[PDB]
Protein backbone atom coordinates (compact mmCIF):
# COMPACT_ATOMS: atom_id res chain seq x y z
CA UNK A 1 0.00 0.00 0.00
CA UNK A 2 2.61 2.53 1.14
CA UNK A 3 4.97 0.37 -0.92
CA UNK A 4 2.74 1.00 -3.99
CA UNK A 5 3.15 4.80 -3.68
CA UNK A 6 6.96 4.44 -3.27
CA UNK A 7 7.03 2.15 -6.37
CA UNK A 8 5.12 4.78 -8.40
CA UNK A 9 7.69 7.46 -7.26
CA UNK A 10 10.73 5.23 -7.99
CA UNK A 11 9.37 4.40 -11.49
CA UNK A 12 8.73 8.08 -12.34
CA UNK A 13 12.30 9.14 -11.28
CA UNK A 14 13.80 6.33 -13.43
CA UNK A 15 11.86 7.15 -16.59
CA UNK A 16 12.54 10.90 -16.23
CA UNK A 17 16.27 10.05 -16.82
CA UNK A 18 15.32 8.90 -20.32
CA UNK A 19 12.59 11.30 -21.44
CA UNK A 20 10.50 14.39 -20.49
CA UNK A 21 7.34 14.07 -18.38
CA UNK A 22 5.43 14.88 -21.65
CA UNK A 23 6.55 11.48 -23.11
CA UNK A 24 5.80 9.41 -19.98
CA UNK A 25 2.27 7.94 -19.78
CA UNK A 26 0.23 6.90 -16.74
CA UNK A 27 0.35 3.43 -18.32
CA UNK A 28 4.16 3.51 -18.17
CA UNK A 29 4.06 4.51 -14.48
CA UNK A 30 1.38 1.95 -13.56
CA UNK A 31 3.24 -0.81 -15.46
CA UNK A 32 6.63 0.03 -13.84
CA UNK A 33 4.95 0.09 -10.41
CA UNK A 34 3.18 -3.29 -10.98
CA UNK A 35 -0.36 -1.94 -10.51
CA UNK A 36 -3.24 -1.18 -12.88
CA UNK A 37 -3.96 2.23 -14.37
CA UNK A 38 -7.15 2.67 -12.26
CA UNK A 39 -5.10 1.75 -9.12
CA UNK A 40 -2.60 4.60 -10.00
CA UNK A 41 -5.42 7.13 -9.67
CA UNK A 42 -6.10 6.02 -6.10
CA UNK A 43 -2.55 7.31 -5.22
CA UNK A 44 -2.18 10.35 -7.58
CA UNK A 45 -4.55 12.53 -9.66
CA UNK A 46 -1.99 12.97 -12.49
CA UNK A 47 1.60 12.39 -13.65
CA UNK A 48 2.14 16.11 -12.78
CA UNK A 49 1.19 15.38 -9.14
CA UNK A 50 3.82 12.58 -9.05
CA UNK A 51 6.56 15.09 -10.14
CA UNK A 52 5.47 17.56 -7.42
CA UNK A 53 5.91 14.84 -4.75
CA UNK A 54 9.35 13.86 -6.17
CA UNK A 55 10.46 17.54 -6.11
CA UNK A 56 9.12 18.02 -2.57
CA UNK A 57 11.16 15.04 -1.34
CA UNK A 58 14.41 16.30 -2.96
CA UNK A 59 14.02 19.91 -1.73
CA UNK A 60 13.29 18.66 1.86
CA UNK A 61 16.32 16.31 1.65
CA UNK A 62 18.56 19.34 0.81
CA UNK A 63 16.86 21.45 3.53
CA UNK A 64 17.41 18.74 6.21
CA UNK A 65 21.11 18.39 5.23
CA UNK A 66 21.56 22.15 5.60
CA UNK A 67 19.91 21.98 9.10
CA UNK A 68 22.50 19.34 10.16
CA UNK A 69 25.31 21.80 9.26
CA UNK A 70 23.56 24.68 11.01
CA UNK A 71 23.24 22.61 14.24
CA UNK A 72 27.01 21.97 14.43
CA UNK A 73 29.86 24.34 15.33
CA UNK A 74 32.30 22.44 12.98
CA UNK A 75 35.75 24.16 13.66
CA UNK A 76 36.54 25.47 10.12
CA UNK A 77 38.09 28.33 8.08
CA UNK A 78 35.54 30.74 6.48
CA UNK A 79 36.07 29.50 2.86
CA UNK A 80 35.62 25.88 3.96
CA UNK A 81 32.44 26.84 5.91
CA UNK A 82 30.76 28.25 2.78
CA UNK A 83 32.10 25.42 0.61
CA UNK A 84 30.45 22.68 2.73
CA UNK A 85 27.10 24.56 2.62
CA UNK A 86 27.21 25.13 -1.19
CA UNK A 87 28.21 21.42 -1.52
CA UNK A 88 24.93 20.35 0.17
CA UNK A 89 23.05 21.71 -2.89
CA UNK A 90 25.54 20.66 -5.57
CA UNK A 91 25.42 17.03 -4.24
CA UNK A 92 21.69 16.79 -3.41
CA UNK A 93 20.43 18.31 -6.72
CA UNK A 94 23.26 16.66 -8.69
CA UNK A 95 22.23 13.21 -7.35
CA UNK A 96 18.70 13.88 -8.66
CA UNK A 97 19.35 15.61 -12.02
CA UNK A 98 16.24 14.33 -13.87
CA UNK A 99 13.83 15.34 -11.04
CA UNK A 100 15.68 18.76 -10.73
CA UNK A 101 15.40 19.46 -14.45
CA UNK A 102 11.70 18.41 -14.85
CA UNK A 103 10.88 20.29 -11.60
CA UNK A 104 12.47 23.55 -12.85
CA UNK A 105 10.52 23.38 -16.15
CA UNK A 106 7.20 22.71 -14.33
CA UNK A 107 7.54 26.02 -12.44
CA UNK A 108 6.21 27.72 -15.63
CA UNK A 109 3.02 25.59 -15.81
CA UNK A 110 2.34 24.56 -12.21
CA UNK A 111 1.38 26.97 -9.39
CA UNK A 112 2.13 24.31 -6.74
CA UNK A 113 5.63 23.69 -8.16
CA UNK A 114 6.27 27.46 -8.47
CA UNK A 115 5.20 28.00 -4.81
CA UNK A 116 7.24 25.04 -3.41
CA UNK A 117 10.45 26.37 -5.08
CA UNK A 118 9.76 29.98 -3.99
CA UNK A 119 9.09 28.84 -0.36
CA UNK A 120 12.39 26.96 -0.01
CA UNK A 121 14.46 29.65 -1.83
CA UNK A 122 13.08 32.25 0.67
CA UNK A 123 14.10 29.97 3.58
CA UNK A 124 17.60 29.36 2.16
CA UNK A 125 18.11 33.12 1.48
CA UNK A 126 17.05 34.04 5.08
CA UNK A 127 19.54 31.50 6.52
CA UNK A 128 22.39 32.79 4.25
CA UNK A 129 21.60 36.39 5.39
CA UNK A 130 21.56 35.31 9.10
CA UNK A 131 25.01 33.68 8.71
CA UNK A 132 26.46 36.84 6.95
CA UNK A 133 24.98 39.03 9.77
CA UNK A 134 26.67 36.83 12.42
CA UNK A 135 30.02 37.11 10.58
CA UNK A 136 29.61 40.91 10.55
CA UNK A 137 28.66 40.91 14.28
CA UNK A 138 31.93 39.25 15.36
CA UNK A 139 34.03 41.48 13.03
CA UNK A 140 34.92 38.71 10.55
CA UNK A 141 33.14 40.35 7.53
CA UNK A 142 32.75 44.09 6.50
CA UNK A 143 29.40 45.99 6.60
CA UNK A 144 28.96 46.49 2.82
CA UNK A 145 25.66 45.67 0.98
CA UNK A 146 22.42 45.01 2.86
CA UNK A 147 22.91 41.31 3.82
CA UNK A 148 19.49 40.07 2.60
CA UNK A 149 20.01 41.68 -0.83
CA UNK A 150 23.54 40.21 -1.11
CA UNK A 151 22.17 36.77 -0.04
CA UNK A 152 19.34 36.95 -2.67
CA UNK A 153 21.64 37.62 -5.69
CA UNK A 154 24.15 34.89 -4.46
CA UNK A 155 21.37 32.30 -4.16
CA UNK A 156 19.83 33.16 -7.59
CA UNK A 157 23.33 32.82 -9.10
CA UNK A 158 23.62 29.29 -7.51
CA UNK A 159 20.15 28.32 -8.85
CA UNK A 160 20.82 29.39 -12.46
CA UNK A 161 24.47 28.20 -12.56
CA UNK A 162 23.95 24.72 -10.94
CA UNK A 163 20.94 23.92 -13.16
CA UNK A 164 22.62 25.18 -16.43
CA UNK A 165 25.65 22.95 -15.51
CA UNK A 166 23.52 19.87 -14.73
CA UNK A 167 21.54 20.24 -18.00
CA UNK A 168 24.66 20.72 -20.17
CA UNK A 169 23.28 24.12 -21.29
CA UNK A 170 25.18 26.34 -23.72
CA UNK A 171 26.54 28.58 -22.03
CA UNK A 172 27.43 26.84 -18.73
CA UNK A 173 30.31 26.20 -16.28
CA UNK A 174 31.60 22.58 -16.57
CA UNK A 175 30.06 20.45 -13.76
CA UNK A 176 33.63 19.70 -12.52
CA UNK A 177 34.40 23.48 -12.12
CA UNK A 178 31.06 24.75 -10.77
CA UNK A 179 31.68 24.31 -6.95
CA UNK A 180 35.08 26.13 -7.05
CA UNK A 181 33.49 28.90 -9.25
CA UNK A 182 30.56 29.57 -6.88
CA UNK A 183 32.73 29.39 -3.68
CA UNK A 184 35.22 32.03 -4.99
CA UNK A 185 32.34 34.45 -5.86
CA UNK A 186 30.64 33.91 -2.45
CA UNK A 187 33.84 34.35 -0.39
CA UNK A 188 35.15 37.48 -2.22
CA UNK A 189 31.70 39.22 -2.18
CA UNK A 190 31.00 38.41 1.51
CA UNK A 191 34.49 39.25 2.88
CA UNK A 192 35.71 41.81 0.33
CA UNK A 193 35.95 45.47 1.34
CA UNK A 194 36.42 45.89 -2.43
CA UNK B 1 4.35 48.00 -46.40
CA UNK B 2 7.44 48.20 -44.18
CA UNK B 3 5.22 50.43 -42.03
CA UNK B 4 2.71 47.53 -41.76
CA UNK B 5 5.36 45.19 -40.27
CA UNK B 6 6.46 47.91 -37.78
CA UNK B 7 2.77 48.47 -36.81
CA UNK B 8 2.35 44.72 -36.16
CA UNK B 9 5.52 44.79 -33.92
CA UNK B 10 4.43 47.95 -32.04
CA UNK B 11 0.95 46.46 -31.39
CA UNK B 12 2.37 43.16 -30.08
CA UNK B 13 4.76 44.96 -27.62
CA UNK B 14 1.85 47.09 -26.30
CA UNK B 15 -0.53 44.20 -25.70
CA UNK B 16 2.20 42.08 -24.04
CA UNK B 17 2.24 44.74 -21.22
CA UNK B 18 -1.33 43.72 -20.39
CA UNK B 19 -1.44 39.96 -20.95
CA UNK B 20 0.59 36.84 -21.93
CA UNK B 21 1.12 35.91 -25.59
CA UNK B 22 -1.34 33.00 -24.90
CA UNK B 23 -4.20 35.56 -24.47
CA UNK B 24 -3.32 37.70 -27.52
CA UNK B 25 -5.00 36.67 -30.79
CA UNK B 26 -3.91 37.26 -34.39
CA UNK B 27 -7.17 39.21 -34.67
CA UNK B 28 -5.99 41.53 -31.87
CA UNK B 29 -2.65 42.08 -33.65
CA UNK B 30 -4.24 42.60 -37.08
CA UNK B 31 -6.84 45.01 -35.62
CA UNK B 32 -4.20 47.05 -33.69
CA UNK B 33 -2.06 47.21 -36.85
CA UNK B 34 -5.01 48.33 -39.06
CA UNK B 35 -4.79 45.39 -41.48
CA UNK B 36 -6.87 42.26 -42.04
CA UNK B 37 -6.10 38.86 -40.53
CA UNK B 38 -5.11 37.37 -43.93
CA UNK B 39 -2.78 40.39 -44.48
CA UNK B 40 -1.03 39.58 -41.11
CA UNK B 41 0.00 36.19 -42.49
CA UNK B 42 1.81 37.84 -45.39
CA UNK B 43 4.20 39.40 -42.77
CA UNK B 44 4.39 36.62 -40.08
CA UNK B 45 3.52 32.89 -39.91
CA UNK B 46 2.36 33.13 -36.26
CA UNK B 47 2.10 35.30 -33.13
CA UNK B 48 5.16 33.30 -31.88
CA UNK B 49 7.18 34.55 -34.89
CA UNK B 50 6.25 38.16 -33.97
CA UNK B 51 7.70 37.66 -30.42
CA UNK B 52 10.94 36.22 -31.87
CA UNK B 53 11.40 39.37 -34.00
CA UNK B 54 10.66 41.65 -30.99
CA UNK B 55 13.24 39.73 -28.87
CA UNK B 56 15.82 39.85 -31.69
CA UNK B 57 15.48 43.64 -31.92
CA UNK B 58 15.89 44.15 -28.13
CA UNK B 59 18.91 41.79 -27.82
CA UNK B 60 20.64 43.52 -30.81
CA UNK B 61 19.87 46.95 -29.27
CA UNK B 62 21.68 45.86 -26.05
CA UNK B 63 24.54 44.32 -28.09
CA UNK B 64 25.04 47.53 -30.14
CA UNK B 65 25.09 49.67 -26.96
CA UNK B 66 27.78 47.41 -25.47
CA UNK B 67 29.84 47.79 -28.73
CA UNK B 68 29.72 51.62 -28.33
CA UNK B 69 31.30 51.25 -24.84
CA UNK B 70 33.89 48.78 -26.09
CA UNK B 71 34.96 51.20 -28.89
CA UNK B 72 35.72 54.02 -26.41
CA UNK B 73 38.60 54.39 -23.92
CA UNK B 74 36.34 56.38 -21.47
CA UNK B 75 38.82 57.51 -18.65
CA UNK B 76 37.18 55.79 -15.61
CA UNK B 77 37.81 53.97 -12.29
CA UNK B 78 37.40 50.15 -12.44
CA UNK B 79 34.08 50.04 -10.46
CA UNK B 80 32.58 52.73 -12.71
CA UNK B 81 33.77 50.82 -15.83
CA UNK B 82 31.84 47.67 -14.83
CA UNK B 83 28.85 49.72 -13.63
CA UNK B 84 28.33 51.41 -17.03
CA UNK B 85 28.49 48.00 -18.80
CA UNK B 86 26.02 46.31 -16.39
CA UNK B 87 23.78 49.42 -16.78
CA UNK B 88 23.52 48.79 -20.56
CA UNK B 89 21.56 45.59 -19.77
CA UNK B 90 19.58 46.89 -16.79
CA UNK B 91 18.34 49.86 -18.92
CA UNK B 92 17.81 48.07 -22.26
CA UNK B 93 15.92 45.04 -20.81
CA UNK B 94 14.21 47.22 -18.18
CA UNK B 95 12.84 49.51 -20.94
CA UNK B 96 11.32 46.42 -22.60
CA UNK B 97 10.04 44.39 -19.62
CA UNK B 98 7.04 42.74 -21.37
CA UNK B 99 9.12 41.58 -24.39
CA UNK B 100 11.93 40.39 -21.95
CA UNK B 101 9.49 38.39 -19.83
CA UNK B 102 7.57 36.74 -22.75
CA UNK B 103 10.92 36.08 -24.51
CA UNK B 104 12.40 34.29 -21.46
CA UNK B 105 9.30 32.04 -21.12
CA UNK B 106 9.37 31.16 -24.87
CA UNK B 107 12.88 29.68 -24.48
CA UNK B 108 11.18 26.53 -23.08
CA UNK B 109 8.89 26.04 -26.13
CA UNK B 110 10.77 27.65 -29.02
CA UNK B 111 14.09 26.36 -30.45
CA UNK B 112 14.66 29.65 -32.33
CA UNK B 113 14.15 31.71 -29.13
CA UNK B 114 16.39 29.31 -27.14
CA UNK B 115 19.16 29.60 -29.79
CA UNK B 116 18.96 33.43 -30.11
CA UNK B 117 19.38 33.85 -26.29
CA UNK B 118 22.20 31.26 -26.12
CA UNK B 119 24.04 32.96 -29.07
CA UNK B 120 24.05 36.42 -27.47
CA UNK B 121 24.87 35.12 -23.94
CA UNK B 122 27.95 33.34 -25.44
CA UNK B 123 29.02 36.61 -27.13
CA UNK B 124 28.52 38.67 -23.93
CA UNK B 125 30.44 36.07 -21.82
CA UNK B 126 33.40 36.06 -24.30
CA UNK B 127 33.60 39.89 -24.14
CA UNK B 128 33.45 39.89 -20.29
CA UNK B 129 36.28 37.27 -20.22
CA UNK B 130 38.39 39.35 -22.71
CA UNK B 131 38.03 42.45 -20.50
CA UNK B 132 39.02 40.47 -17.30
CA UNK B 133 42.07 39.03 -19.20
CA UNK B 134 43.16 42.57 -20.21
CA UNK B 135 42.85 43.74 -16.57
CA UNK B 136 45.02 40.79 -15.50
CA UNK B 137 47.56 41.55 -18.30
CA UNK B 138 48.24 45.10 -17.05
CA UNK B 139 48.41 43.95 -13.38
CA UNK B 140 45.11 45.57 -12.32
CA UNK B 141 43.38 42.25 -11.37
CA UNK B 142 44.78 38.99 -9.75
CA UNK B 143 45.10 35.64 -11.63
CA UNK B 144 42.47 33.66 -9.66
CA UNK B 145 39.71 31.58 -11.40
CA UNK B 146 39.85 30.75 -15.11
CA UNK B 147 38.45 34.02 -16.60
CA UNK B 148 35.87 32.38 -18.93
CA UNK B 149 34.42 30.33 -16.04
CA UNK B 150 34.26 33.42 -13.77
CA UNK B 151 32.60 35.40 -16.62
CA UNK B 152 29.99 32.61 -17.20
CA UNK B 153 28.75 32.46 -13.56
CA UNK B 154 28.68 36.35 -13.35
CA UNK B 155 26.59 36.61 -16.52
CA UNK B 156 24.14 33.84 -15.44
CA UNK B 157 23.74 35.66 -12.11
CA UNK B 158 22.86 38.91 -14.04
CA UNK B 159 20.33 37.01 -16.24
CA UNK B 160 18.47 35.36 -13.33
CA UNK B 161 18.65 38.39 -10.98
CA UNK B 162 17.60 41.12 -13.52
CA UNK B 163 14.65 39.06 -14.81
CA UNK B 164 13.43 38.01 -11.28
CA UNK B 165 13.57 41.77 -10.33
CA UNK B 166 11.71 42.94 -13.46
CA UNK B 167 8.96 40.30 -12.98
CA UNK B 168 8.47 41.08 -9.26
CA UNK B 169 9.33 37.43 -8.45
CA UNK B 170 9.37 36.15 -4.87
CA UNK B 171 12.36 35.98 -3.99
CA UNK B 172 14.01 38.94 -5.80
CA UNK B 173 16.22 42.02 -5.25
CA UNK B 174 14.15 45.27 -5.42
CA UNK B 175 14.54 46.85 -8.91
CA UNK B 176 15.96 50.00 -7.19
CA UNK B 177 18.78 47.93 -5.49
CA UNK B 178 19.66 45.48 -8.29
CA UNK B 179 22.41 47.54 -10.11
CA UNK B 180 24.35 48.28 -6.87
CA UNK B 181 23.97 44.56 -5.83
CA UNK B 182 25.37 43.16 -9.11
CA UNK B 183 28.22 45.74 -9.34
CA UNK B 184 29.51 44.92 -5.80
CA UNK B 185 29.57 41.14 -6.60
CA UNK B 186 31.33 41.72 -9.97
CA UNK B 187 34.00 44.08 -8.57
CA UNK B 188 34.88 42.01 -5.45
CA UNK B 189 35.04 38.69 -7.43
CA UNK B 190 37.12 40.17 -10.31
CA UNK B 191 39.59 42.19 -8.16
CA UNK B 192 39.56 40.20 -4.90
CA UNK B 193 42.61 38.11 -3.97
CA UNK B 194 40.17 36.74 -1.37
N1 LIG C 1 20.41 27.34 -5.34
N2 LIG C 1 20.40 26.84 -4.34
N3 LIG C 1 20.41 26.31 -3.33
C1 LIG C 1 20.68 27.15 -2.13
C2 LIG C 1 22.21 27.30 -1.95
O1 LIG C 1 22.90 27.03 -2.95
N4 LIG C 1 22.75 27.69 -0.76
C3 LIG C 1 24.24 27.87 -0.59
C4 LIG C 1 24.73 27.73 0.83
C5 LIG C 1 23.82 28.54 1.80
C6 LIG C 1 24.32 28.50 3.23
N5 LIG C 1 25.29 27.72 3.68
C7 LIG C 1 25.38 27.95 4.99
C8 LIG C 1 26.29 27.33 5.85
C9 LIG C 1 27.34 26.57 5.56
C10 LIG C 1 27.99 26.11 6.65
C11 LIG C 1 27.53 26.49 7.86
S1 LIG C 1 26.17 27.46 7.54
N6 LIG C 1 24.49 28.87 5.37
O2 LIG C 1 23.79 29.25 4.24
C12 LIG C 1 22.43 27.90 1.80
C13 LIG C 1 21.79 28.03 0.40
N1 LIG D 1 22.43 39.12 -18.36
N2 LIG D 1 22.88 39.83 -19.10
N3 LIG D 1 23.31 40.57 -19.85
C1 LIG D 1 24.80 40.57 -20.02
C2 LIG D 1 25.43 41.46 -18.93
O1 LIG D 1 24.71 41.71 -17.95
N4 LIG D 1 26.70 41.93 -19.05
C3 LIG D 1 27.33 42.77 -17.96
C4 LIG D 1 28.45 43.68 -18.43
C5 LIG D 1 29.42 42.90 -19.37
C6 LIG D 1 30.60 43.75 -19.81
N5 LIG D 1 30.72 45.05 -19.62
C7 LIG D 1 31.87 45.41 -20.20
C8 LIG D 1 32.38 46.71 -20.22
C9 LIG D 1 31.98 47.78 -19.54
C10 LIG D 1 32.69 48.89 -19.84
C11 LIG D 1 33.70 48.78 -20.72
S1 LIG D 1 33.68 47.15 -21.21
N6 LIG D 1 32.47 44.35 -20.75
O2 LIG D 1 31.67 43.25 -20.51
C12 LIG D 1 28.66 42.51 -20.64
C13 LIG D 1 27.52 41.53 -20.28
Curated annotation (Swiss-Prot), chains A, B:
Species this chain originates from: Mycobacterium tuberculosis (strain CDC 1551 / Oshkosh)
SUPFAM superfamilies, per database record: Homeodomain-like (SSF46689), Tetracyclin repressor-like, C-terminal domain (SSF48498)
Superkingdom classification of source: Bacteria
Subunit structure and binding partners: Homodimer.
Record-linked Pfam families: EthR_C (PF21313), TetR_N (PF00440)
This protein's UniProt keywords: DNA-binding, Repressor, Transcription, Transcription regulation
Keyword flag Zinc-finger: no
Residue ranges flagged as DNA-binding region: 25-44
Protein name: HTH-type transcriptional regulator EthR
Gene3D superfamilies hit by this protein: Homeodomain-like, Tetracycline Repressor, domain 2
InterPro entries attached to this UniProt entry: EthR_C, Homeodomain-like_sf, HTH-type_TetR-like_transc_reg, HTH_TetR, Tet_transcr_reg_TetR-rel_C_sf
PROSITE patterns, per the entry: HTH_TETR_2
Record-level Gene Ontology MF annotations: DNA-binding transcription factor activity; transcription cis-regulatory region binding
Stated role: Involved in the repression of the monooxygenase EthA which is responsible of the formation of the active metabolite of ethionamide (ETH).
Residue span, HTH tetR-type domain: 2-62
